[PDB]
Design a protein around this ligand. Sequence first.
Ligand code: CA
Ligand code: CA
Lengths: 178, 178
Amino acid sequence: LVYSEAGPVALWLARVRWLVILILTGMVTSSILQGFESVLEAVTALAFYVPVLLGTGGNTGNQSATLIIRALATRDLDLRDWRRVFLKEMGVGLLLGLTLSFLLVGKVYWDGHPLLLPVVGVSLVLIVFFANLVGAMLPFLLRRLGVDPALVSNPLVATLSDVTGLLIYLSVARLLLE
Amino acid sequence: LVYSEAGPVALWLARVRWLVILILTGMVTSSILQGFESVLEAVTALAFYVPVLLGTGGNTGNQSATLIIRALATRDLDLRDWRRVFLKEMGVGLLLGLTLSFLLVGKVYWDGHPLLLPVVGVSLVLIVFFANLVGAMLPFLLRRLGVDPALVSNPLVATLSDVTGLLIYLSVARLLLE
Ligand SMILES: [Ca+2]
Ligand SMILES: [Ca+2]
């Protein structure tokens, strides 16, 4: 695993296995949007907010994941502490969600899509809330599984949050639009 | 910040600023999609592959960056070696891009959208290629900027890959689908 020693194909071999697993998971995302593609054609403006909504969720989780990983390493927390972290993180995620939601809803207003105003705002609270919890619990899960959290955590929270983020957004959109 | 000692309001305060900065950059993605909303209405089928494409790009960059951060941290590489890393990583990205593209094109076929097969296939090669180089060069730039790459590299690449990723995909979409 010496990069300077390593070669282009050699670098390819180690990395490819990992990325291929993520893309297969990423493929599930495309299938999700198909049921809600009916809804998507009705109001095109849904497509715009998808990357930022998922992106924000991704940031929220990784932040939480990083904090928990650090504390776990320095024994601030022990694997037993995860339930307490859960109850705590709900409050933190909630506050973050409403705060970040106020930011994004304001943009939707500027953009000029009123119907999207309720859809995006509620979702982001929900996106941030769930993504946060996934973020904190992932290191506890990984440590219990005997895997170093650092290497695997970051792409995992990103991909899980992207998927979870889509379902909430689309379902909320469907309910409010049908 | 000691996590266990901290409280829900306290945890909220530190976290928000970084997330708020990130969401503002994340907002740029929606605005991008607006110009290409012209393109989007033409084919509803574009919206599906957007999250996986941005998601795949995000993993690729963070993967490469992590290797670079590690190698630079353990003095495998010197700031001077960035040219050599560039030529090497571009080769890696081409192969990775080509491999993952082949996978996704198969999915697009399963989904049943033939016209989208070339646009998504070509774009994903391009996304992975750039994301790989961006990933490797980011630690070199930040280290040169005199700030430790590790903490900041990850969210940066994530938002950058989303924006760059959108432009590549949509512009390619514009060209091939008029
Ligand atoms: Ca992302
Ligand atoms: Ca349409």
